[PDB]
Structures are given as C-alpha cells and as structure tokens.
Design a protein around this ligand. Structure first.
Ligand SMILES: Cc1cc2nc3c(=O)[nH]c(=O)nc-3n(C[C@H](O)[C@H](O)[C@H](O)COP(=O)(O)O)c2cc1C
Ligand SMILES: Cc1cc2nc3c(=O)[nH]c(=O)nc-3n(C[C@H](O)[C@H](O)[C@H](O)COP(=O)(O)O)c2cc1C
Ligand SMILES: Cc1cc2nc3c(=O)[nH]c(=O)nc-3n(C[C@H](O)[C@H](O)[C@H](O)COP(=O)(O)O)c2cc1C
Ligand SMILES: Cc1cc2nc3c(=O)[nH]c(=O)nc-3n(C[C@H](O)[C@H](O)[C@H](O)COP(=O)(O)O)c2cc1C
Ligand SMILES: Cc1cc2nc3c(=O)[nH]c(=O)nc-3n(C[C@H](O)[C@H](O)[C@H](O)COP(=O)(O)O)c2cc1C
Ligand SMILES: Cc1cc2nc3c(=O)[nH]c(=O)nc-3n(C[C@H](O)[C@H](O)[C@H](O)COP(=O)(O)O)c2cc1C
Ligand code: NA
Ligand code: NA
Ligand code: NA
Ligand code: NA
Lengths: 67, 67, 67, 67, 67, 67, 67, 67, 67, 67, 67, 67
C-alpha cells in the first residue's frame, strides 16, 4: 500500500564524511517530505595542497510518497 | 531522438511480491506519464509475529520524457 | 566427470513471477534434456494502462550434457 | 548502541517464492529472537518433470542482538 | 556545503553511442540547470533488419542543486 | 507465454565500438531469427603499434524462441 | 591449518560511523573470541527531523575458530 | 570482422579445480570448434563424509564463430 | 519445507587451494551436521620470502537445518 | 611463467569514446612497453553549454613485464 | 588530450576513517604530482582488545600525467 | 600511520592455479619490497588442442610503502 521514492544526492564537506551526509540531508529536507532512510553508495573527494579538499558522499535518500 | 527517465520506487504489500510491484506502479501512474517498463533491483521486507509483515520491492520505473 | 551447460532464457507472463518462470521451463523441456536447476538473474516487465502488462523473468537453466 | 546480526538462510517450497520466504522465517523464529527484516539475495530452484520442483530463496535475516 | 543531485536518463539514437548520450544531455538541459557530469551505466539497444535499430545509453546526469 | 533466449557474443572491429556491435549482429542474423535487443556487457580490445588494434565488444543478444 | 569464521553484524550509533563500528565490535567481543579483522559492507541510516537519526554500518567480523 | 560466442559450462571433478576445468574443456572440444579462452565465474561443490565430494567450476568458454 | 543455513568460513593452507577448502570443511563437520554444498566467495593469501606463505579461501558452507 | 601488469588510466577527448581510449593508449606507449590489451571500466564525462564537453574513459591497460 | 593515472593505496589510522584517508593522501603527495581526486573502494580494519585497533581505507588516487 | 599500495598483476602458468599465482609473486618480489598479501580477482585462461593451454590468474598484490 505504501510507496516510497529514492533520490540520489551528493553531499560535500571539507570537514568529514558525517558532515557531507548531513549536508545532503539538510538540503533534502527543504524540498522533500517524509524522509526515512539513506544508503551510502560511494565515498570520493577532491585533493588539494593539504590533502583532502572536499569529501563527497554519494547517497540515496528514501522517502514516503503521499496519496 | 527519444529520451527516457528512470525513477526508483519502493512498493510495499502484506500480500506478496506482485502486489508490491503493482502498488508502486499504481502510485507512479498518478503522477508520471508514458510509463513503459520496470526493473526489480531488490526484494526485502519486514518480519512480524506471523512471518513476513511487509514485502518491499525496490523498483526502477522507466518512462518516456515529453517534448 | 559430469559436465553441465547453462542456457539463459527470458520467461514472460501476464499473471506473475512463478508463471513467467514456468513458461521458460515449459519451453526449455521441449528441446533440452536433463534439466536440473535454474537461477533467476533478473526480474523486469512492461507497463500498461492497468499496471503490469507483462512480467519478464530472466533465468539461467542448468542441465546435464550427454556423452 | 544497538547491534544487529544477520544470518543467511535458504527457504524452500514447491508452492512459490513467498511460501519459500515464509518457510525460512518460520524456522528462523523458533530459534532466533527479535527478527526485524530480511533481504533476498538469490532466487533459484530445482526442475522436475512438471517444471519447477522446488523454489529456493536465499535470504538474509536481520535481528537485534540482546544485552 | 554544495549538494548535487543525480538523475537517471536513457538517451537513444539510430546513429551511435555519442549521439545517444548527446540526445539525453540536450533534453536534460531544457529542464535542469547547472549540469556538471555524466556517468554511463549501461549500453543496450534494439535490433532491426539492418542490425542496430536504436542505440540506448542509460546515463546518470549530475547537477548542482541551488539554494 | 512468449519465451526469449539470450546468447553471448563478442563482436570485433578495427574501426570502433558501433562497428564491433554491428559485426556481432550481422553474424547473429545469419543463424538466429527474431533478434530483438542487445545488452553490452563489456568493452575491451587489443593494443598495437598505433594504439587500438582491435575493439572487442562483449554483447548479449536476445531473441524470441519459436513454437 | 587455521580456520576463521565470519559473522555479519550491523552496528548503530547516533554519533557517527566509527562509533557505529565500535558498537558492533564491543557487542561482538562479549560472545566471540579471537576477533581479528572487520570489513565494512554497507553504510546506511535513518533520517529524523535534525538529519541523521541513526548511522548503521553493516560489517563482517572475522575471527579464528578454536580446536 | 571476427565474431566469437561464449557458452557457459559447469565442469566437475572429485580431484580438484584444474581437473574440473579440464573436464569442461574436454567435453566442449567434442562439439565446439575454435575454442580460444575461458573465464571462471564461480567455484562451488558438494560435501560428503570425507569433505569435498565434488568440485564444481562454473566456466565461460569463448570460441570463434565460422563464416 | 526444508530450510538450510549458510555459514561463512575461511580455510587456510600452505599447500594450495583445494587443501584450504578441505581444512574449512574438516573443521565445519566437527560442529555442523548435514553439510551439503559450498561456494567459494574469495581467494586471497599472505606472502612470504618464498612466495605464497598461506592460501586463504573464503567459503560459504550450506547445510540442512533440523526439525 | 609470463607475468603481466595492469595500470589504470583515464583517457579524455572532446571528440568521442574511441578518441578518449586512443589518447590513453598513446600516452601509455611513451612510457610502458609490451602493451597487449585494455579493458574499459567506466565511461563518464563533463557537461558544457553544448552538451558533452569532455568524454572520459576509465581504462585498464595490460602489458607484459620483462625479465 | 589530458590523461590521468589511478593508483590504489591503503591508508591506515588508529583514529578514524578521515585520518586513514589523509594518511594515504599525505604519503601520495610526497611522490606523486597533480593529485586531483580519490575514490574509496573499501573500508576494513583490525580488531584489538579495545575494539578497532586500526582503520584501513582502500583508496584509488587519481592524478594528471605530465607531457 | 602505515600506508600500503596495491598493484594488479596477471600470473600465468601451464601447470595450474597455484603456479600461476607463484609466478606473479616471484616476479613481484624482484622489484617490489615488503610484500604482504594478495587477492585473486579473476581466473581465466587460454585453450589449446589438449584443453587448458595457459592458466591466467589476475591478482592484486599489497605491499607496505616506505618512509
Ligand atoms: C533501456 C531500456 C530498457 C528497456 N527494457 C525493456 C524490457 O524490460 N522489456 C520490454 O518489454 N521492453 C523494454 N524496453 C522497451 C520499452 O518498454 C518500450 O516498449 C520502448 O522503449 C518504446 O517506448 P515508447 O513507445 O514510449 O517510445 C526498454 C527500453 C529501454 C529504453
Ligand atoms: C553449479 C550447480 C548448481 C547447482 N545448484 C543447485 C541448487 O540450486 N539446488 C539444488 O537442489 N541442486 C543444485 N545443483 C545440483 C543439481 O540440481 C543436480 O541435482 C545434480 O547436479 C545431479 O544431477 P545429475 O544426475 O543430472 O547430474 C547444482 C549443481 C551444479 C552443477
Ligand atoms: C561525485 C561527483 C563526481 C564527479 N565526477 C567528475 C568527473 O567525472 N569528471 C570531472 O571532470 N569532474 C567531476 N566532478 C566535478 C564536477 O564536474 C564539477 O566540476 C564540480 O563539482 C564543481 O562544479 P560546481 O561549480 O557546479 O559545483 C564530480 C563531482 C562530484 C560531486
Ligand atoms: C528482458 C528483456 C529486455 C528487453 N530490453 C529492451 C531494451 O533494451 N530496449 C528495448 O527497446 N526493448 C527491450 N525489450 C523489448 C524487446 O526488444 C521486444 O521489443 C519485445 O520483447 C517484443 O518482442 P517480440 O515482438 O519478438 O515478441 C526487452 C525485452 C525483454 C524480454
Ligand atoms: C580472509 C582474511 C582476511 C584478512 N584481512 C585482513 C585485513 O583486512 N587487515 C589485516 O590487518 N589483517 C587481515 N587478516 C589477517 C588477520 O587479521 C590476522 O592478523 C591473521 O589472520 C593472524 O591471526 P591469528 O593470529 O589469529 O591466526 C585477514 C585474514 C583472513 C583469513
Ligand atoms: C587492506 C589490507 C588487506 C589485508 N588483507 C589481509 C589478508 O588477506 N590476510 C592476511 O593475513 N593479512 C592481510 N592484511 C594484513 C597484512 O598482510 C600484514 O600482515 C599487516 O598489514 C602487517 O604488515 P606490516 O608489518 O608490513 O605493517 C591486510 C592488510 C591491509 C591493509
Ligand atoms: Na567518519
Ligand atoms: Na511471487
Ligand atoms: Na563510439
Ligand atoms: Na587448484
């Protein structure tokens, strides 16, 4: 009876992996409703002069569809 | 020339796998047009006192984009 | 000593997943002998006005080779 | 804080896929407690004179560990 | 800080693989903004009397989300 | 009701990827009937003094079985 | 001569990924002996009003079997 | 210009893995011509009272198609 | 009706791959009953001064559950 | 007796997929000797105002090691 | 025109996942030039008396090749 | 603190799988130092008039990086 949708996002952060995930979820909840779960598909990033420049976490976000 | 889009849905049902797929497709067709095919990516579910509580079928739905 | 062969078939049905599998196996046994096991590789289908038009079960069929 | 364990089972049935899953879950709940979810990893089976002899559903069962 | 979204499209063409990709991207840029990268997930197609009828390139398109 | 079979071929060409696919399909249609679709599984090749010697496209070809 | 066993656990934590792993390992060492290594299979989680509710790390734990 | 075909076989042997592969290739060369390469997809087997009863090597065999 | 369980083991040996598998199965049969089949998931090992120090075969062992 | 090494390269081109592969192989042969084969692992690219800006082909290059 | 190379490293740390990545990148930049991006392939580790002994992050590092 | 590197090799032998692995490791230790572990990625080979001509084992070799 219930139907969910999954959207694929890429959260980024200079701080770490959790912050990268949280950035994705923060943006997701502005536009999507009934956010339930997430699944990390991929962890990558960019490299700068001091090592990791940007952590990039490719993420699926699952949420309940209405009506 | 033709371009399609794929959306990832999770259909659920207490009855079985086909009903779970049909629940996803029924909801899809309310909002999406030119639904053509589907691809089952994953079959999971929740467990209750009497065994399977809910069947959950993770599904990609392909449809033609307009214009 | 024994050698088996695997053939990849796609069974279809408007009724459900088991019927799709059975359609593949019914056709397989007309031409192939010593059918032993099957492995479902993929579940997909077509969509019509009333939801699932056709279930399509991609299937490997394993059978013993003679001689 | 919570920790879960996953066990891999193979449920079988001459009837169909749901019944195969249910057979696994029925046996699981005799010995395991706090059964929460399952994930189907694989669908296979044996072939007889009348097509499918036995459906075999390879399944992961997730449950909460105590203390 | 930056968040991207990925959408899955299927571009088609009778001419070849690059044209199939380009058809997807051309349609994508009508509706989506800040298109950055793509990832080919799958190459398939239909067969006609003269060989390949239609090339079909399943593609993920990544773009920056605003705000 | 309808049952398809999939055969795995490797098409080769010194020209490019599309030609390699077309070589596989051209040979397929001499012996197989009711060719419907293809799925590229793998792209590889051999290297010579001037770069790519031979493109090799590993391909599944799907066709309807008769009777 | 030596034989190891692998058990699949899911560690959870509201804090982060390392804490989720550590929760799994802490529970593991209460019951299992000769714990040697782990392999992360999957990172997922639940979503709440403030973003990540629970981080869930699916983990294989390898340990030496006795006698 | 050249087109190859791949057939999937399962070689078995009570001796070991190489013998299992050789059993498959021996049977293959009775019926197939221009055998070129093989790819091991899977290694499994049956268990008896003295350990391994039968080694089973699932194998793809590639060969050149004529004309 | 019948339900099986799968356990994941790592057999090791300085001799070779078969011996590594047999070591796993020998230990398995001391504690587990109704051992039926195995599936090799992974082959790895350690390196010493004379090449392979230890072969390590990651293996799933399937057995029938009682009552 | 023979040992090969595989190196992973990313060839790029504004023209197409073959040219991207050829760019990788051209650079490879300046530094590496006894180049034998390649395997395409991934096809991606960047997007510009006119569609595909750059095709990027992630490629494994296999070559014979000396002495 | 541009060609990149990918090298596979395993960074380790007793502190956490980010530190493990950073250790790999720190060592990489001593010897490699034009480091651009990384891709995490695998997360594993060793277990000690107090849980995680060492986090081990298997990582691909991509960098631009010169001239 | 410690960083490892992984190199991908293909060992070959007319004798068997272990010998193929050993050939790769023998060549590796001439040029690489602090060789620790290996992971078999793939088993393939060539076919001759008497069955297996050459066994080919695709192998990752992991070793500790210095300074
Ligand atoms: C990549 C992709 C996958 C498809 N898979 C299937 C398949 O699952 N089974 C099927 O019957 N048709 C499949 N089709 C064909 C579509 O279902 C549909 O019949 C065809 O694309 C025509 O769509 P249209 O008339 O809306 O343009 C596939 C098409 C594409 C683009
Ligand atoms: C690689 C392979 C996979 C098999 N998978 C199954 C399985 O799915 N379930 C099962 O009951 N038997 C399985 N079997 C055993 C066969 O179903 C069959 O019982 C056995 O090969 C003996 O049959 P035969 O007398 O025709 O040689 C498998 C055998 C092989 C070779
Ligand atoms: C996960 C992900 C994958 C990316 N893959 C590529 C790549 O395929 N090739 C490339 O040139 N850039 C790649 N990029 C970088 C983007 O193409 C883009 O240049 C960058 O995100 C900055 O764009 P922005 O200003 O729109 O944020 C990737 C970025 C992310 C988030
Ligand atoms: C599992 C499978 C995969 C398919 N994939 C595609 C797809 O790649 N693209 C497409 O246009 N049609 C796809 N089709 C649809 C077929 O190409 C074909 O149009 C349809 O099955 C009707 O075939 P028939 O008229 O010979 O019975 C697929 C069909 C099946 C069975
Ligand atoms: C299949 C398998 C995988 C292993 N993976 C790792 C690895 O991830 N990192 C590591 O440091 N050790 C790894 N080990 C080695 C063990 O952690 C341990 O150091 C070694 O087996 C010695 O254990 P023992 O003294 O109990 O016999 C692995 C061992 C096996 C059998
Ligand atoms: C990612 C990775 C995978 C490993 N896998 C194994 C394993 O397959 N089996 C094993 O015995 N050791 C494994 N190890 C541990 C190494 O073989 C080695 O024993 C350990 O890293 C100590 O090496 P060192 O003294 O040079 O620092 C692994 C180590 C790493 C980093
Ligand atoms: Na972290
Ligand atoms: Na069903
Ligand atoms: Na092309
Ligand atoms: Na062997």
């Amino acid at each position: 009876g219930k139907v969910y949708k999954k959207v694929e996002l890429v959260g980024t952060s200079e701080e770490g992996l959790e912050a990268a995930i949280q950035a994705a979820l923060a943006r997701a909840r502005k536009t999507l409703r009934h956010l339930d779960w997430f699944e990390v598909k991929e962890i990558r990033g960019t490299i700068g002069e001091a090592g990791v420049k940007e952590y990039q976490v490719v993420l699926e976000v699952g949420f309940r569809l209405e009506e």
